[PDB]
Amino acid sequence: SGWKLIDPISDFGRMGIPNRNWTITDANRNYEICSTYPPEIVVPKSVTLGTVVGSSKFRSKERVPVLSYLYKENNAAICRCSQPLSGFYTRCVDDELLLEAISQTNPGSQFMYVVDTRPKLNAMANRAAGKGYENEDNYANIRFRFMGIENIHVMRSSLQKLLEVCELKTPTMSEFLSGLESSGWLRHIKAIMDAGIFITKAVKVEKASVLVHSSDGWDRTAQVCSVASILLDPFYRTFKGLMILIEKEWISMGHKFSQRCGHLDGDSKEVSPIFTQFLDCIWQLMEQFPCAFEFNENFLLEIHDHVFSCQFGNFLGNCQKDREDLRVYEKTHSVWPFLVQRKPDFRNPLYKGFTMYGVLNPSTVPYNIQFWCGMYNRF
């Protein structure tokens, strides 16, 4: 019952789903569509199972396009998936049909964005290894954009570089700022945010739906989709809101916490501070909007702690099927009740409530993107 406190799928309820446009399939009830997706997924109503599975077989690791967020007010939505398996030549009808079907849930807009979170160069590299990205020729009325966020290896490097600098024996400012710049860390934070802001404007301003993918659709995809949601919707700026976004977009959707956070092996090329960057992105917004969020800096820092402590079950393993196999929902407890106990210590006292802010328009002029002391004092 501790576990019934935060149910990711209720959030779909909150955006008026199911409806004329979107339904919740249990088709993945036994992980038959995709082994790293949740049992329940949301796809367009107008699509058959055969089209979903056929798309699945054209997406990397079967991570088929699936809804992440719907903006009630204008019906624009954000979807997420892995990269396509197109190479230089291959097309797939069921795939092309599924993206065609997503855009049709927003008849208003004449085109749909396909946002690729990667740099063009990396997308090209993956295309040469039999993967790649969608072609504007084979996908009717799409507008392809690269976001340019680097991969997990570059991120692990960047953080390693920054901590090495921060631990220097009595350094000057010029030494420190030189090292900060070298690490690239704030470039990476700034990139993720900018990609968030791009998608936000796509959805709010242009009223256009967006399909987001990275390579595997579970690192940069989770970051940038989450950030966009926090930008669009006040709900995710609340205790329950954020608790929910994390269970939905990170935990259930199969960000590999056990591998990324080193629960079993810390010396692996699979370790990377991807969830850290996401919390950092929320921190940046809090700094820029001292009144917009219900929670304070401490909330994020405690969440970050238990992502690593393994004190709770929420973040164990690398997907929902893993967690089900670990019997985690029966034999362990959930963070969220535990953190709800401690809300007194987590409340932003400058918070101006739910109805105050709508969509946030931060600036990412670099003097706004700052080193986060409270965080790079826990490493």
Add this chain to the structure above:
Amino acid sequence: SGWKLIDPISDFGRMGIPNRNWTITDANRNYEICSTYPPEIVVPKSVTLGTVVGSSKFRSKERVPVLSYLYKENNAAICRCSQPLSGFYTRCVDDELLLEAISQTNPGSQFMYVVDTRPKLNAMANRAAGKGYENEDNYANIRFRFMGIENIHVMRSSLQKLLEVCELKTPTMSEFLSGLESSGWLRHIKAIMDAGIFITKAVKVEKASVLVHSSDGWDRTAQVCSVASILLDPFYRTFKGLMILIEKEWISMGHKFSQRCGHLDGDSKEVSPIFTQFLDCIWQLMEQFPCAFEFNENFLLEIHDHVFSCQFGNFLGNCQKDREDLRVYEKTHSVWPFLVQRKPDFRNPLYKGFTMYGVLNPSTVPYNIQFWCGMYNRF
């Protein structure tokens, strides 16, 4: 009548003065000892009038050693002055004696500190111009220390570089970071803080009294003395406290606000962000101690706003005499009352009260000395 709300001398009372070691002399009542000092001033009890004037004539601008702050618990004190007129060889019994009287108001410590805020190369250039600095060989148990804080033309050039960076058209994170390093601004605010922390640790840990001087004793001497004061005493972290600190150490002691803040001539080589740097240092402490200060970021910024707006009277003129002779007391209003009526907007919700903190112990590792958006968004 609002011109009486904040009275500087009252702060001497608060530290228990007059007493067995310190008095308020009337000697400068008609500004005949020092023209740029205020009418009342604090010197040791054991000192004669003849020694005070004798010393003043061996100090640049006649800005003789006077008391800045007495740490009651310790009897260790902080005095301030201008550089001595000792050149290469000349000495002065009167100046030597007045420094020994200062140290003999704190008999517990076998030595007194003398703190030169300048880098030694500057102090040497001043020596070659017939001024300079004290020789440990000519003075009673002094340990002489350079703080390395650069001059006003450097500070001016620095802020000027920094703003040029910030208003660059869409800079990469790298361009900004490299420009922030080049401007040197954070190097300067760190040095100031480090000077403050040096003094602070002298008084608290070693129970050693400190004489602080620069060249003219009214820019760097004010920054450093003030920062050490905030670090030692909670009183200056309250609303009234800081208004008193600014009246006492900055306005009454003759920091040339009009020349500095560009009231008269903005093109002047005399313009320099000295007070700006000071508010920055307070904010840096507020960020490291979000519960220690009664006021918030806005209190500093509004204060700063008016120092430049010339809407009230308090920062007009370059010292007390200028101020009295222009009759500003009579012709405009004080800022301080005007700010008390707006305290709702200045309060720090996380303030844990007066007795919760003692001597603050900040870190000046370059990563927690940060760029202040609030401030360089006003320029």
